[PDB]
Amino acid sequence: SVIPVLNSGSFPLEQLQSFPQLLQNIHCLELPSQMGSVLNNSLLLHYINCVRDEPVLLRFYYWLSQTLQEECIWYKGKEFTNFLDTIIRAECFLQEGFYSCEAFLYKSLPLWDGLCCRSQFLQLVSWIPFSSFSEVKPLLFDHLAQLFFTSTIYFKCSVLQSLKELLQNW
Amino acid sequence: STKESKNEKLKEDLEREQRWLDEQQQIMESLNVLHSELKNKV
């Protein structure tokens, strides 16, 4: 299963089935053993948006990073595309980018052909954390230019849209 | 065709944005009223 099955005076997580229940019990929530079900459950995403907890950050980072690695190695497809679409949908929320996706894209961009999951890849570059334009170019924008100078004109318009979305987000 | 496609895409994204805004609203009033109740109780 791509998304782990959720396993549970703190409010029990299973009893969380309605929005008013979350409204009443937001203070006494308990962190799940696995937070993958947080992705497809918007109820826990509401508490995740403000929890700002250090351990759960690392726990979700390692989770999603190893999940991305195993999905990518198993691909070489529709389920992978759907999972990445769900990740992108969650990324639209929280108004901030993830780091597991950033590391995965850094690792896979040089190996990227430009057509495996282009739709999926180009929407992650939109949500890239703000950084000085002196470390990303040597690692990220070089291969971006490599593809840009040689790929299709429609791919050029595509990466233009991606970078303008990045500029808007920044 | 790209222009239409992005038009409906932006419309859908805007509707989703209002949905999220509405939900986080009652989230905010619930959090504020809970905080006030806890402050008054102590």
């Binding site: 739709s119 | 790209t2 496609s5 992005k6």
Partner: peptide, 12 residues
């Protein structure tokens, strides 16, 4: 949307 449209353009 428009990105899916561009992808279906490279499909051509």
């Amino acid at each position: 949307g428009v990105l899916a449209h561009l992808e279906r353009l490279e499909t051509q």
